[PDB]
Every structure is written in C-alpha cells, then in structure tokens.
Amino acid sequence: LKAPVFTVRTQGREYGEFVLEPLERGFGVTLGNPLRRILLSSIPGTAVTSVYIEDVLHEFSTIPGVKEDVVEIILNLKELVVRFLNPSLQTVTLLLKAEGPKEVKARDFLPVADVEIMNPDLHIATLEEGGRLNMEVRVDRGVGYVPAEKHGIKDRINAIPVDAVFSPVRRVAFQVEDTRLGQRTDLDKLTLRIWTDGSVTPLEALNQAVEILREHLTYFSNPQA
Amino acid sequence: KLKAPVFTVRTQGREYGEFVLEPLERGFGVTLGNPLRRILLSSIPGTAVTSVYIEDVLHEFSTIPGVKEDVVEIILNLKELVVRFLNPSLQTVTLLLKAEGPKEVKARDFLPVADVEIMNPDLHIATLEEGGRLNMEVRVDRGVGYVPAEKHGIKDRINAIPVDAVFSPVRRVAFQVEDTRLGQRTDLDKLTLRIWTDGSVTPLEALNQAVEILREHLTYFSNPQ
Amino acid sequence: ITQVRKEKKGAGLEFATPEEALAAHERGEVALNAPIKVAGRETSVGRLKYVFANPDEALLAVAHGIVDLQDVVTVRYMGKRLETSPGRILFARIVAEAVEDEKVAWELIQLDV
Amino acid sequence: RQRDIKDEVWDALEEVIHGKVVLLNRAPTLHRLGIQAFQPVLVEGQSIQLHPLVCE
Amino acid sequence: QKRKLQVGDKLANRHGNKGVVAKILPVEDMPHLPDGTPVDVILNPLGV
Amino acid sequence: YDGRTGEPIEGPIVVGQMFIMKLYHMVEDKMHARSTGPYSLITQQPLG
Amino acid sequence: AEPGIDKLFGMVDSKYRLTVVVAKRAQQLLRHGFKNTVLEPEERPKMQTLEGLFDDPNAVTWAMKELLTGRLVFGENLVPEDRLQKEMERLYP
Ligand SMILES: [Mg+2]
Ligand SMILES: [Mg+2]
C-alpha cells in the first residue's frame, strides 16, 4: 500500500482535524489510540502554579471589596491560558493591580515580554467600590497534573500553591472510516481531532505526540539480556 | 523527566520470548503494548499454504480411500506447516508430494524447491496404508495476518481446495503492564511483552519488525496536504 | 465468553452437501450458528465454514474479527476435533496455563457448558 | 514529625516487612476466616486493598 | 484543609447506590464517547 | 470506546449523567495505626 | 501460597508440627545469625534491595526453604535440650 496522504484542517489555534488515508485494516486504532493517549497525558504546557494576594494569608479568606473569595479567584485562575512565546522561558510572574468598581479580567494583567494571554476575557474577580486586588500570579511550564500538595511552590511567605493542570490538550477524538482503494475495501481512514486551549496549536500537539511515540519506540533497540 | 528504560530480553529458542521495558511513564505500558500487539498479529510478513490439490478429491469434506486422515485433517495439517522463503524475490511456490502406502507422510516428503525451506520437517501430514495413493499439490503464498479460504479463494486448477492462510508467523502475543517505582515515583509502569512464533522468525525479529512498522507509520504525519 | 450464540435465521433448513449449506450462508439465508442439517447430521454453518488446526489459529481469527468468542466453530485441540466456541477453547487454555498441565486441566473442566 | 521523615525510611520499611505477613480482621468474626494472613504490599493512600476472592 | 476525592472516600447517589472510590484513572484510560468525551464515574451494573 | 485499547466495548453501554454525592465518611478520618501508646489505669490494657 | 507448602504439609503427620519445626528452626537461625544454615550459597534466600541482592532477613522464609531440602532432622526426643544448645554454641559461636 502506498504512503497515505496527510490532510490538515485547522480552525484557529484551538481545533484541528488530521486525516491519514488510506491505511491498512486495523491501523486506524493502531495509530490513533497511542497518539490520543500521548496527547491527553504527555503534552507539555503552562499552568498557574502559585498565587500571592496582598493582605491575604491563606486561600480560605475573603478580600474586602471583592465579591469572590480566594478559593473562587484561584478557581478562575486555574482556567487562565498563558502561552510562552519563548521556548527557553520556564516561569513567568503576572502582576495584577486593579481598583474597584470593576470586573477584573485576564486582560488586566500587566504585559510581560514573550508572554501572551490566550483568553483575555476570562473573568477573575468582581471588585466593589473601595476594593483592591493586588496579586502576583506565577505561571510555570510542565507536563501532567501536579497537585498543589506535590510541588508546593511559594515564591514568598504568603504565596498560595495552586494545583497545576499543565496539559494544553482539552479533548482528543479519532475517527476510523471505511475508505477503499483499487479493488480492496478493507482499508482505513484515520481522522485525528484535537481540541486545545490555544497556547499550543493542535498541529504542534500532534507533532509533539508523534515525537514522543517515536522516541519511545527507540527504547526497543538495545536488547539487554 | 524520566530516565530511559532498560530493555531486557529472555528468549527460549526461536518460538518464544519475553521482553521487559522499565521504567515507563504512567500509562505508557498500554500506550506501547497494544499497538505492538496489533501490529504483531496482523502485519508481520510470513508465508502460508493458500491452496491444496489432491488427486481424486472432489471437495474438502470428502475422504481419500486408503488413508486414515480425511481431507479436512490433511488440510488442517497443512495449516500447521511452517515454510520460509530464502529468496526475497520469490513470491509464490507450489510443493509437490507423492507418497505410497503404508508409510507415514511427513513434511520432509515434500519435493525440495529452490530457496524454499521447511522449518518443521517432522510435521505429520497424513498416514497411508497398503494400496493407498496420496498425490498432493500445495500452493504456498506470501502475506500478512489471517485470511480465510473463502475470502482469498485461491485455486490453482480445477478441484483445488482453498485453505485458510495463516500468514502471520506470530502465533500469540500477550503483554502485561505492572506497576513499578523508581524512588519517590510510584505510578511508573513496567511492560512485559510475550510473543509466541511459529519459528520462521525469532520473536525478537518479530518485535523488531513490529516496532519498525509502527515507526514507519509515524513518519506519515510529515507532509500536510 | 463460554456461552455460545444461538441463531434463528436458518434454524431448520436441510441440504444435500455441505457446500449447499455454506452457499446459503453467503446469500444471507442462514446464520452462522443457526442449527441446520447438512445431509443427515445436525450441525451449523460455523462448524463447517471455520475449522481451525489449533487454538492459536482459532484465537488469531478472533483477533482479526473473523469469528467471535461466542460463535461455535470446529477446533482441533489435543488431537480431538472439537466443535466448540473459541471462548470455551480459551477457557480451556486459561486453566491449562494456570495449572501448567494441559492433560490434567483438560480433565478438570466441563467444556460443553 | 511528618516533614522530618526522609525518603530512605520508606526504603527501609520495605526491607522491614519483607517476608512478613499481617492479619486482616473484619467484624463480626462469625467464622475463623474472618481473620486471615496477608503479605503486606506498601501502597500510596490510606485504604487497605483487599483481594476480591477473600471477600466472601 | 481542602480535601479532594481520593481512594477510599465514600460516594453515593440518591437511589441507595453507595461505594468507596477504588481507582482513580487518568483521562486517557477512562472509556470515552465517539466524540472523545471520557466518562467521569464507572459503576458496576451488578449492583442493580 | 476503550481508552486503553482504542477498540469499542463489545456491547453498547448505558452512559449518562447522574448526581453523585460525596459522603461524610472519608478514609482520611478513619485510617489509624498504633505500635505503642497510652494504656488503661486498672487493666493496663491499651486504650481504644 | 508459600512455596512448596503442599510438600511441607506432606512431610508431617500434623500441620501444627510443621509450624513448630519452622518456628523453632527460624529461632535457631536468628540466634546464630544464619551461620548454622544447611543451605548452600546458591540456595540462600535473597531479597531485592536498592543497592543489590542481599540475604533474606526473614528467618521463617529460611526455615521453610531449609526444610524442603531434607537436610534437617526433626522429631520428638531427638537430643537433650541443654546438649543441643551447647553443641550448637560450639560449632556456631
Ligand atoms: Mg490550562
Ligand atoms: Mg473453511
């Protein structure tokens, strides 16, 4: 069977369809599933790891003039999507200064070089008149799910560790169709669908997933006995 | 990141082998085990009998006078025959067998063919009696996987009986994922891959081909559109 | 895995040769496990269409989707041409490998249930 | 102190329990199989892992 | 302390079905819909 | 579909959205161990 | 199950005699620091440690493995208790 044609259909930086056809019978699951498992587990990304709020000692407190408590603010921060434009950048600290009455969004963070916020309309807190929100948010780069009890990252004394879900891939689904070529009708059409938060394009996630699988297949090369 | 896992092999003969890869990241035993199992059972090239012609035989469900084994049992014995083509250019061969009773027909009774090796020459084909004739012509082809006789339907001449072609040299694959630890990491996976083969290819050879087939397919995610 | 499938598509058709019985199956008149009579004996299409030399071939066909674990076929196990499903053959191998004695394990199990 | 426990203690604990067994007991101990001996396997968590076959 | 769900914690529904969490699987290990949506909880049908 | 193998479950599965509660009984509050410790006044047996 | 448990049970007339022999042999091994073992160096039980394989510290495992070999003589009224101890002290100080 000749080399399959690879077709890429992308809708922005969040969705992408990747079609590989024609494949031999049963290679849709053979190729799709390892990529899906690697995409959903082993794709590096950036997530909020630690947060420090002025005049806040722990996450079980409320800030005067702020409708949301620190628990809800941290929950809103866990949905923040931060994209590092520099591959060598490993950690950034985002500075937020806001005074009520306003609805402080993710776009209110002070700009940082080589850092882009992919969801500027994310709502963080609702400030009441006379309320202030001065906070530093630490965004690290990693892979997997690291609970706040494991990393325990605190830039300073009153920093609050935040459970970090680094994986940028939101959802992966792959589809196997009944394509035919010539006189044989048992062939497979594999279509990989990847949903991401936008920091890593689905094509980038697919390329990283292929490399990880390819890199692991090289582990079968030196047979110790 | 995690250290490169150690690949250990424990092969007994040319028909069975155990392969262990550890330590692996959590969930990568399944990520690497299932695709290899699928490729091993459906993609490793091999040879099998795809058609048999026996003189005076009309159908598969008949019986030859003067022989213990009916046509079905002779056909079943042919499906156990393991033959290796020594010439890569060679594609299909026919093996001639003429035997006279009351001898016991073995796989070594096939007439020798250029660049054709019978891996198990002690295989029992049929048992003849005094006054019995066994004029048999078996056609051996090259392929992958399992193909039923009704599917390929290969017949050399009239009254030929197509036979299910067990192309895959790999007889059985059983992989196991075991939890292991490396210091403070407790979610690590240890993959144990067990392969049974007919002997034409070593189980290490079968695994190497399966890895290469998986590696080759990963290169298909290279040229978009 | 050890329970067999029962079909109702054919369920009674009689023929003259096995090839006629198989020929109806590809036409869709009789199902795989439908109980039929080939010439005088009562069998099914599965036991005629699929005859396996050993359990390894039978379970290889299952992996390729040719047959299911609940489909009744003909398998050559321990020198006896059995007429059982691959799942029942699979259960026999489960006991044989666990006890590491094929002969004794064969005497310990009730295969036909 | 929990924060004073180093990572070598867990390696030593594995050596300590090697070969040894513990008794698992569920009340009411209606018959003698209500107490059984198992070889402990150190796991992360706070729940005892029970084999399915001994449940009955 | 902010307690997350862990193995051994007891869950229940309004219909009397109760049990402790015995395994926490990664998202890529749970059974998923054809559109790629994994399930959150797996219940044994034998309790019905 | 199966997240490990990628192959579907051989039969359709009843999948849906159900309301599950996290009960007050947690393994964190129930795990307990003891080698030596307090003993009773009269019987000198361990406390409970 | 314990290795060779079926063979161990068949070597005694009562299963509780097996436990007594194993436990008494385990104490003899512990008391003399496993220097009275009847096990050859290829037969000594081993445990997998981070540094490497070492002798199994569980004497009950040693006692069960020694008894399968058949080099141990067990029974009632074999030797005087005081005579047995003093002789074992001299051979294995
Ligand atoms: Mg995120
Ligand atoms: Mg057939």
UniProtKB/Swiss-Prot annotation, chain A:
Residues 1-224 are annotated as: Alpha N-terminal domain (alpha-NTD). One of its GO terms (cellular component) is cytoplasm. Transmembrane segments: none annotated. Keywords: DNA-directed RNA polymerase, Nucleotidyltransferase, Transcription, Transferase. Its EC number is 2.7.7.6. It catalyses: RNA(n) + a ribonucleoside 5'-triphosphate = RNA(n+1) + diphosphate. GO terms for biological process: DNA-templated transcription. The keyword Transferase applies. Homodimer. The RNAP catalytic core consists of 2 alpha, 1 beta, 1 beta' and 1 omega subunit. When a sigma factor is associated with the core the holoenzyme is formed, which can initiate transcription. Belongs to the RNA polymerase alpha chain family. The N-terminal domain is essential for RNAP assembly and basal transcription, whereas the C-terminal domain is involved in interaction with transcriptional regulators and with upstream promoter elements. DNA-dependent RNA polymerase catalyzes the transcription of DNA into RNA using the four ribonucleoside triphosphates as substrates. This is DNA-directed RNA polymerase subunit alpha. The gene is rpoA.
Swiss-Prot record, chain D:
It comes from the Bacteria. DNA-dependent RNA polymerase catalyzes the transcription of DNA into RNA using the four ribonucleoside triphosphates as substrates. The RNAP catalytic core consists of 2 alpha, 1 beta, 1 beta' and 1 omega subunit. When a sigma factor is associated with the core the holoenzyme is formed, which can initiate transcription. Belongs to the RNA polymerase beta' chain family. This is DNA-directed RNA polymerase subunit beta'. It comes from Thermus thermophilus (strain ATCC 27634 / DSM 579 / HB8). The chain holds residues 679 to 734 of 1524 of the full protein.
Curated annotation (Swiss-Prot), chain E:
Signal peptide: none annotated. It comes from the Bacteria. DNA-dependent RNA polymerase catalyzes the transcription of DNA into RNA using the four ribonucleoside triphosphates as substrates. The RNAP catalytic core consists of 2 alpha, 1 beta, 1 beta' and 1 omega subunit. When a sigma factor is associated with the core the holoenzyme is formed, which can initiate transcription. Belongs to the RNA polymerase beta chain family. This is DNA-directed RNA polymerase subunit beta. It comes from Thermus thermophilus (strain ATCC 27634 / DSM 579 / HB8). The lineage of its organism: Bacteria, Thermotogati, Deinococcota, Deinococci, Thermales.
Curated annotation (Swiss-Prot), chain G:
Gene3D superfamilies: 3.90.940.10. Its EC number is 2.7.7.6. It catalyses: RNA(n) + a ribonucleoside 5'-triphosphate = RNA(n+1) + diphosphate. It is an enzyme of class 2 (transferase). One of its GO terms (cellular component) is DNA-directed RNA polymerase complex. InterPro entries: DNA-dir_RNA_pol_omega, Pol_omega/Rpo6/RPB6, RPB6/omega-like_sf. Keywords: DNA-directed RNA polymerase, Nucleotidyltransferase, Transcription, Transferase. One of its GO terms (biological process) is DNA-templated transcription. The keyword Transcription applies. The keyword Magnesium does not apply. Belongs to the RNA polymerase subunit omega family. The RNAP catalytic core consists of 2 alpha, 1 beta, 1 beta' and 1 omega subunit. When a sigma factor is associated with the core the holoenzyme is formed, which can initiate transcription. Promotes RNA polymerase assembly. Latches the N- and C-terminal regions of the beta' subunit thereby facilitating its interaction with the beta and alpha subunits. This is DNA-directed RNA polymerase subunit omega. The gene is rpoZ.
